[PDB]
Design a binder for this molecule. Sequence first.
Ligand SMILES: Cc1cc2nc3c(=O)[nH]c(=O)nc-3n(C[C@H](O)[C@H](O)[C@H](O)COP(=O)(O)OP(=O)(O)OC[C@H]3O[C@@H](n4cnc5c(N)ncnc54)[C@H](O)[C@@H]3O)c2cc1C
Length: 424
Amino acid sequence: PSRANTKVIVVGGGGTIGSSTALHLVRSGYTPSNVTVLDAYPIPSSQSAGNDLNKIMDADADPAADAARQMWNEDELFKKFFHNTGRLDCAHGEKDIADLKKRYQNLRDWGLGATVEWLDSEDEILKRMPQLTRDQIKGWKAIFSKDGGWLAAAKAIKAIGEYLRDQGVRFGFYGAGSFKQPLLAEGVCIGVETVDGTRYYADKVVLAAGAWSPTLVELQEQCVSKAWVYGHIQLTPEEAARYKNSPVVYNGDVGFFFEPNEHGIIKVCDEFPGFTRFKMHQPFGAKAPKRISVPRSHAKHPTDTIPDASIVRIRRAIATFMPQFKNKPLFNQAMCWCTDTADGHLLICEHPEWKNFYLATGDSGDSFKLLPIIGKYVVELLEGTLADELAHKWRWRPGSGDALKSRREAPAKDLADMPGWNHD
Ligand SMILES: Cc1cc2nc3c(=O)[nH]c(=O)nc-3n(C[C@H](O)[C@H](O)[C@H](O)COP(=O)(O)OP(=O)(O)OC[C@H]3O[C@@H](n4cnc5c(N)ncnc54)[C@H](O)[C@@H]3O)c2cc1C
């Protein structure tokens, strides 16, 4: 078929890469009624890693991230969800400071020197963030990124879902949206079947199932799914007013926090290598069950919280960043799932055996900032127009390294070994 006549199913279309793909199909002139978004949960999916009050907009010298940054500034659908507060990337101790100097030097060497400034003392840091405590940031240096800030993530995906609804995109959710298998005819994918038995037929299928991708089809451990954690504190209107338009504050050895949302709520994250949840599971294409990391979904198990070890790290972030708030209860604790490749690059490729089935995953914990742009690259993959360098960087690559460690400091620990999260 031609493009007005091409049917495409986006599996995981309630999440980050999937909603972006559906948007870029519509914007590229695919007929909205020929696009079907399938998700386990209605857009924005309650288990999407993008279903979050906030994410950091930390675009670097990377072409895709920079193209995304421009859309967060200029695109009429997205721009209202980007808060250009700036970002403090803070470092403490001999090794982290040396790595921050080098990151700074690299950004100068890459021609972003005008967007960033080196803060060489605590006085320089308190100038940009006077709500910090001088005592707790003794010896800290920072890169202040003027271009940075934070993204109203769940609101941005919701806004894509409302736009797609109004265009006449087709939806299937719950049993009617939860992918079970591809429909294959002589090695060609011609649609999908969901858990309730519903079949959808299309010319092309995109698997944008995030941390669920390696659970749904055999990916030969090129993606390993891991959880990260957050909790919330509630500020009085007077407390929240002191933090209005605060930059994002990050320290790789502490974690990070955001300015309060419109309800006075501050989200706090630690910084760590993520948690697996290994269990026996048989993805489509696997000859028998395998021990793989299967997300433990907060949407399916809303009584779940986070490990005790995670609460302690978040309390330490609050004690370091916001000592006056050590007494506030930490609430709406949740695990948030991503999938790492060995090299931390995306997995955006045609399936090597199932023609017209495409992977769009490998988010590796840092892809929410790509929400505006990433579906453009997926449409280019479907159309055969993706740049060779990106076709290689995002290629099918089992056996290319250990995704349990990936490019992080250590192999992820497992939730089986981390008490405090399960309240069943
Ligand atoms: C705590 C945390 C903090 C983060 N901070 C940042 C940050 O500051 N900046 C940044 O850029 N990135 C950040 N990230 C990373 C970012 O959130 C992810 O890289 C990105 O959102 C992943 O997008 P995705 O589309 O691959 O997955 P998702 O958005 O999770 O989408 C996957 C979708 O697949 C659906 N699905 C699952 N199973 C099925 C099925 N059987 N059938 C159909 N659909 C299914 C899910 O319901 C979901 O909607 C953070 C992530 C977490 C968890």
